[PDB]
């Protein structure tokens, strides 16, 4: 008889409804349709197609789907972002990172659970672009706050794992006397950094290298930074190369630059902490973030574990801070300002 | 300042939270972890790993993620399905079809929007397995209802586009005198049909062929069916081969078998119908279904368009029915019982 | 041990969380705090208190609660509506009607279920004010559409059950030649109608009487209307007085005014229709509306039942319409344009 | 045109949909219909009406409403709880307390905001009954944990503000040597306590008085307790009588009973703590709880404020604990075990 089944089905597949919507919102941003709708205000599928080189029947399908979900409005003149659609704008970075960057990673979990199946891959270009969008809200303000508490002034900044160069673009626009150098291991991210830096008019003050963090420190680069930023880099080295390699990397920084100020941003691994995991942002962001870090060759550890690593590498903690409680009040994103002990 | 940003962020990325959960639920089913948890009641990660040949640290990560979302419970003895987790069981087919089958298709939409980029691909084995799970609730009862209104009795049943053979297994178990033949174009689905039929003990009464519908009708098969079931097949032929090809296919059926009873199940294309699109199941299922059918080489049309096609092919409508309002009350899934005019 | 209980509790009491939010949104509107925040943009609790004659500590409590839910933002200068708070503006009428008008009614259901316990009461002033706010979106445009399809032009309009007079104020502003008379049985609503009409500068063209519909038609009023609007009035008479009384009331209208055009708006009782009840607006609005009409002395019937009543009363149907599918696509709100047969 | 309005309306009035559902769930429990459906499994409206003395048409309305929301199932034999309906069972106390007890309080906020309008009233009988239901999960296990850490064993227990006597019934059943006395100021709650104690067969070991806490301590009662439980009582005295009155009350306890063990349960006022307020249970429960305590004559203060009050009253802290993180992981419900300094 299946009495009452339909009502249970609508609730039971609610995650599937939102799964498709998240992918569709990701494409709305990534394809530049969102920016086109902002610019035009109202656009017919024919006009959007001509501008972006798209096929009308596929675009009409995406537009009708988004209209049914309330992201778009449709009038005789075309489609427009609704108030709900406009409200998505600040969140672009999260969609680009988690859907663009990590959709393949989540999809690979079934096969990668098998003995010997290896680590899940990701689209590191989208991870970098997306995380840089996110960093405008959380990590860049945190880095700025810690930099203000260091002695002297920043004149030469080195950012390892720079993604598309957003930290360097923001710091260079706010602090005009700064000279900067960024290194990014992903080729696509490296190319996006060279383009963003050129678009912001900063190519004469900021240079980008296609390199990983450990290999950059071992290279014959000619730059004497007084600040080094390691934003979510150490947990990649920890997973890929091991704890002795992280300790040795940190020792090499202060051996080469004994008066340097280090700013390290890391995520505290509280995946098993019942109270922490009930916070709305812990469920929305950190629970999937922790899951991805079990399937990729990265290792998140606790605040106490990082403090032990810093001590073993011969570093002293100047101050520790978390993100503004207006943006992320979980206390899981922690920034450390360190110096040679 | 970003005043109040966090509250907006938690709401803004709610689709991303559910996107990861839908993928994780899909893997919970597809990897056979769900069936393992049902069988064991409580299983430690070590026990689940030994049984399914998995890696403990990756499995613990998936389990902790699902525990944080309330799908699993954790005690000193291990993990178990919660009441919420147990409640997901009937919906397995939807997760397998839409996530397993069509996740790649949704992910390809950005690139496939470009002029000349072609049709998005899918994992047709998972689409078939998943849709067959769904059909237990909606399409198999609808087919059974229409079959009861035809003259005479079914003795020889042909199912084109049979997926994993679920329609044939259910009809053969309910009606022991039936001899059946199924054709499935996807190799993986064909192999799953041969295995399901063997598992149900029906290999002596039901034969499966690896073939598409049009090519099967043109083959030298030796079977005289009195019923032919075309469950969501015609809209594939319509998209791939065109309307004259669908008309010619239907004419060939009644030319070869003039006394045959045809049962056709199709989805009415009401993607642009405001009232229809506000139904909870229209939003949860049909809105993504319509979107997928704009990106794949399949074409959904309206009830009136199908009736015109049937008339042009020389068929008469015996009766038309929709699914039980206990399972799907949208009126979008329509079954037609036809005969030669 | 209560393993996993908290996660189930947060979901289990979600209706309670939203119950308090709905009441708080209702007071935000009803107390004029919403209009104060629109006017001021940012207001400290001291400024809001001085303007509306409120107590600071109670207001701070309401504001902190709403801030926690994302409806308000707080800065050093005070509180303001967030984008989410601003987006609530069009829905004021629904909150005023269902919470202000009918909260007591829903709360009385337990006691009123008992044999001989009578009908639940309501705050008819808030029901009238709120329903008039709603009517701007659905019933006023429907009435306007039907009036345009009548053979005659409206010059003298009678609105029975006029609430706060919003139909008359809108029609009179749009159609300057109209003279109008409204009757409202609730004293509080009647007083709000006299005030709204005076505020809109329409007291010379619109008169309001404190009276129920049946008693108004039996009174010595001196007005010769060519249009009468009965917007959700007949189902009140049907419940309170019975079907013969509704038939007699309609017969009396066309006996007194044989050339009159009648516009009747009613809600189709589809409470037991599985497909209709899965529409998002059916669940949000019509399911509680049907419930309240089982506990108050009002009786909702079906479209066909109304058409039969009209035939018995000697009325002919000119045309029937439902609301615009941009505002309400359920087809449950129906308007009938009638004349004497 | 109101383009796209309906989609915004369905979301905008979601709090109203859940507001009516919460009230309907409250009555389902409070009227004993929930227990009737558990006992019968399937019940026709006629059978439920005969058993509880209800009117069939009003009951059918409530049942149809709940069926539409998925709480009930309907078959030819009658109505039954669905799996979703069954899952509500543990949450009865929250509905009884917040809806039964405090619905009137929330509804009174608009009028009580006015200068000199006084404190909002509540249904203290339902607050007591509901809070006692909740206490089975959080406060009773917390009290039991603290009692076990005292140097003495409990033989004579006094519970001030006992509600319906649930703490005493649970402790007395688990610990057969205990003699107990409870005081409850609300007459309805007092009568429910006398009945619960009689139903559990404990009238020979537990006596209940109709009295407030301060007046009980000033009375001529003849009982020498070695443990006193003050579960959410002190914040009532603090609001109603002031901080000197709370200090004097605590001093009087240890003057009359110098060897007594005191167990105090209080809610930490973190209403203004951004991170704490993003916890799912903080939003669902504590945010409305804080709001109600701004409109009633009760005053919630912080953990540190309570510890300072205890020091002033001449009490020493033996140990402090919060609730089990399986039931409430906010850390806002705190229990203190105290002795005379
Ligand atoms: Mg990482
Ligand atoms: Mg298809
Ligand atoms: Mg009514
Ligand atoms: Mg009634
Ligand atoms: Mg209290
Ligand atoms: Mg108070
Ligand atoms: Na890893
Ligand atoms: Na297609």
d(CA A302, CA C332): 57
Under an 8 A CB cutoff, do A4 and D70 touch? yes
Chain D residues within an 8 Å CB radius of C327: 2, 5-6, 9
Interface of D with A in 79-118 (CB under 8 A): 82-84
Q: Tell me whether A274 touches chain C (CB under 8 Å).
A: yes
- Determine the Cα–Cα distance for residues B97 and B112; give it in Å rounded to an integer: 21
**Distance from residue C320's CA to the centre of ligand 3 (Å):** 20
Structure tokens at D319: 């140990």
Neighbouring C-beta atoms of residue A310, cutoff 10 Å: 21
Count helices and strands in chain D by DSSP H and E runs: 19, 9
How deeply is D124 buried, as exposed, middle or buried, from its count of CB atoms within 10 A (0-12, 13-18, 19+)?
Answer: middle
C222 vs B127: CA distance, rounded Å? 72
User: Which among C63, C19, C23 is positioned nearest to D285, based on CA atoms?
Assistant: C19
Please state, in angstroms and rounded to a whole number, the distance separating the CA atoms of residues B39 and D137. Answer: 30
- What's the CA-to-centroid distance between C238 and ligand 4, angstroms? 9
- The answer to whether C1 faces chain B, any CB pair under 8 Å, is yes
Q: Is B11 on the interface with C (CB under 8 A)?
A: yes
Query: Ligand 8 mean position to D193 CA, how many Å?
Result: 68
**Interface residue A6 vs chain C (CB under 8 A):** yes
- Order the strands of the A333-340 sheet from edge to edge: A206-210, A179-184, A156-160, A227-231, A261-267, A333-340, A315-322
Do A43 and A60 form a contact (C-beta atoms < 8 A)? no
Is any Cβ of chain C less than 8 angstroms from the Cβ of B75?
yes
B177 — contact with chain C (CB < 8 Å)?
Answer: no
Closest residue, chain A, to D275 (C-alpha): A329
Q: Which of B25, B68, B285 sits opposite A15 (nearest CB)?
A: B25
Residue D319: phi and psi, rounded to 5, are -160, 155
Q: Does B304 touch chain D (CB under 8 A)?
A: no
Is residue B84 within 8 Å of C8, Cβ to Cβ?
Answer: yes
CATH 3.40.50.12780 fits C103-340, yes or no: no
Q: Are strands A315-322 and A333-340 parallel, antiparallel or unpaired?
A: antiparallel
Q: Are C333 and C135 in contact (CB under 8 A)?
A: no
Distance CA D268, CA D320 (A): 13
Q: Can you tell me whether residue D340 is helix, strand or coil? A: strand
CB-neighbour burial class of residue C2 (10 A; exposed 0-12, middle 13-18, buried 19+): middle
From-to residues of CATH 1.10.10.10 in chain C: 5-89
Specify the 3-state DSSP secondary structure of A152: coil
Interface contact flag, D294 C61, Cβ < 8 Å: yes
Ligand approaching nearest to the C-alpha of D240 = 6
Asked if D60 and C279 count as a contact pair (C-beta separation under 8 A), the reply is no
Contact B278/D87, CB-based, under 8 Å?
no
**C11/A contact by beta carbon, under 8 A:** no
Which chains does B contact via 3+ CB–CB distances below 8 A?
Answer: A, C, D
Chains in contact with D, where contact requires at least 3 CB pairs less than 8 Å apart: A, B, C
Contact D300, D290 (CB under 8 A): yes
In C, which residues are within 8 Å of A6 by CB distance? 274, 278
Closest C-alpha to C42, from C84, C69, C86, C74: C74
Do residue B11 and residue C67 have CB atoms under 8 angstroms apart?
no
Terminal CA-CA length for chain B: 74
Residue appearing with tokens 């069954």: D86
Contacts of B163 (CB under 8 A, 6+ apart): B128, B129, B131, B132, B135, B184, B189, B192, B193
* Distance (Å) from the alpha carbon of D29 to chain A's nearest alpha carbon: 22
Distance C293 CA to ligand 1 centre (A): 57
Picking from D7, D68, D70 by the largest number of B CB atoms within 10 A of its own CB, the best residue to mutate is D7
> Ligand 4 centroid vs C125 CA: distance in angstroms?
19
With vertex at residue C53, the alpha carbon angle to CA C49 and CA C57, rounded to the nearest 5 degrees, is: 45
CB contact, 8 Å: C258 with chain D?
no
Which helix (H) or strand (E) element contains residue C315? strand C315-322
Nearest to B16 by CA among D119, D170, C299, A93: A93
The first and second tokens of residue D236, run together, are: 């009532």
Q: Which ligand is nearest to the CA of A266?
A: 1
- Helix C139-148 / helix C166-174 crossing angle, nearest 10 deg: 50
Taking the C-alpha atoms of residue D62 and residue D57, their distance in angstroms, rounded to an integer, is: 9
Task: Select from C9, C15, C137 the Cβ nearest to the Cβ of D18.
Answer: C15
Q: At what angle do helices A287-295 and B14-30 cross, to 10 degrees?
A: 40
Helix (H), strand (E) at residue B37: helix B33-40
Q: Determine the length of chain D.
A: 341
Nearest CA in chain B to C7: B70
Q: Which residues contact D54 (CB under 8 A, 6 or more apart)?
A: C113, C114, C115, D31, D48
Contact A197, A225 (CB under 8 A): no
Phi, psi of D117, rounded to the nearest 5 degrees: -80, -5
The Cα A232–Cα A267 span in angstroms is 7
Q: Do B109 and A62 touch (CB under 8 A)?
A: yes
Tell me the CATH class for D5-89.
mainly alpha
- CATH 3.40.50.150 domain position(s) in chain B: 103-340
The enclosing H or E element of B182 equals: strand B179-184
CB-based contact A3 D83, cutoff 8 Å: no
3-state secondary structure of D175: coil
Element (H, E) at C37: helix C33-40
Contacts of B172 (CB under 8 A, 6+ apart): B178, B180, B200, B202, B205, B206
Residues of chain D contacting residue A285, judged by C-beta atoms under 8 Å apart: none
- HEC per residue, C38-99: HHHCCECHHHHHHHHCECHHHHHHHHHHHHHCCCEEEECCEEEECHHHHHCHHHHHHHHHHH
Q: Which of D87, D278, D280, D329 to mutate to test the interface with A (most CBs of A within 10 A)?
A: D278
CA distances from C300 to B153, C108, C290 (A): 47, 20, 8
Q: What are the beta bridge partners of residue C230?
A: C160, C264
Exposed/middle/buried for C341, CB within 10 Å: 0-12, 13-18, 19+?
exposed
Number of neighbouring beta carbons within 10 Å of residue A226? 16
The ligand with the least distance to the CA atom of A112 is 7
Q: Please, which experimental method was used?
A: X-ray
Neighbour-count burial of B101, counting CB atoms closer than 10 A to its CB (0-12 exposed, 13-18 middle, 19+ buried): buried
Q: What is the DSSP letter of D99?
A: I
Q: For residue C68, what is the nearest residue in chain A, using CA coordinates?
A: A326
Beta carbons within 8 Å of C229's beta carbon, 6+ residues apart: C143, C157, C158, C159, C160, C167, C263, C265
Protein residues near ligand 1, an ion, with CB under 5 A: A 298
Closest CA to B181 of B151, B225, B128, B211: B225
Contact B50, A286 (CB under 8 A): no
Backbone angles phi, psi at C286, to 5 degrees: -70, -35
Q: Which residue has the tokens 């939203």?
A: C18
In sequence order, which residues have a C-beta less than 8 Å from that of residue B298 and are 6 or more positions away? B235, B236, B238, B239, B240
DSSP 8-state symbol, B230: E
Measure in Å the smallest separation between the Cα of B279 and chain C Cα atoms: 4
* Chain C, nearest residue to A278 by Cα: C7
Q: Is the Cβ pair B99, A281 closer than 8 Å? A: no
- Interface contacts (A, C; CB < 8 Å): 11
3-state secondary structure of A2: coil
Sign of CA dihedral D244, D245, D246, D250: positive
How many whole angstroms from D4 Cα to the centroid of ligand 2? 29
The Cα C274–Cα B312 span in angstroms is 35
Q: What is the secondary structure of A80-93 as a DSSP string? A: EE-HHHHHTGGGHH
Give strand pairing partners of D79: D43, D74
Q: Which ligand is nearest to the CA of A289?
A: 1
Q: Are the beta carbons of C58 and D113 separated by less than 8 Å? A: yes
Q: Which ligand is nearest to the CA of C238?
A: 4
Least Cα separation, residue C276 to chain B (angstroms): 8
Q: Does residue A1 belong to the interface with chain D, where contact is any CB pair within 8 Å?
A: yes
- Residues, CB-to-ion distance under 5 Å, ligand 8: B 239
């Amino acid at each position: 008889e299946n009495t009452g089944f339909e009502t249970t089905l609508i609730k039971g597949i609610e995650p599937i409804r939102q799964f498709v919507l998240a992918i569709s919102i990701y494409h709305l941003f990534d394809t530049k349709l969102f920016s086109l709708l902002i610019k035009h205000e109202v656009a017919s599928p024919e006009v959007a197609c001509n501008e972006l080189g798209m096929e009308k029947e596929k675009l009409l399908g995406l537009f009708r789907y988004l209209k049914n979900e309330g992201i778009l409005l449709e009038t005789i003149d075309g489609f427009s972002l609704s108030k709900e659609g406009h409200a998505l704008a600040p969140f672009e970075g999260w969609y680009v990172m988690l859907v663009g960057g990590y959709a393949t990673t989540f999809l690979q979990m079934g096969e990668r659970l098998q003995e010997g199946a290896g680590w899940a891959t990701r689209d590191a270009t989208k991870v970098g672009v997306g995380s840089c969008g996110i960093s405008h809200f959380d990590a860049i303000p945190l880095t700025r706050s810690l930099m203000a508490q260091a002695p002297g002034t920043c004149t030469k900044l080195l950012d390892l794992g720079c993604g598309n160069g957003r930290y360097l673009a923001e710091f260079c626009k706010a602090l005009p006397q700064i000279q900067a150098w960024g290194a990014e291991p992903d080729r696509g991210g490296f190319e996006e950094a060279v383009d963003l830096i050129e678009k912001e008019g900063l190519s004469h003050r900021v240079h980008i290298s296609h390199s990983g963090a450990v290999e950059f420190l071992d290279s014959d680069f000619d730059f004497e930074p007084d600040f080094i930023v390691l934003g979510f880099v150490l947990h990649e080295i920890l997973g890929q190369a091991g704890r002795p390699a992280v300790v040795n990397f940190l020792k090499k920084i202060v051996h080469r630059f004994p008066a340097i100020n280090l700013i390290i941003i890391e995520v505290d691994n509280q995946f098993d902490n019942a109270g922490a995991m009930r916070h709305g942002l812990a469920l929305a962001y950190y629970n999937p973030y922790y899951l991805l870090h079990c399937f990729t060759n990265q290792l998140l550890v606790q605040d106490a574990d990082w403090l032990d690593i810093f001590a073993e590498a011969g570093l002293s903690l100047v101050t520790r801070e978390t993100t503004s409680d207006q943006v992320d009040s979980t206390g899981l994103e922690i920034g450390y300002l360190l110096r040679r002990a």
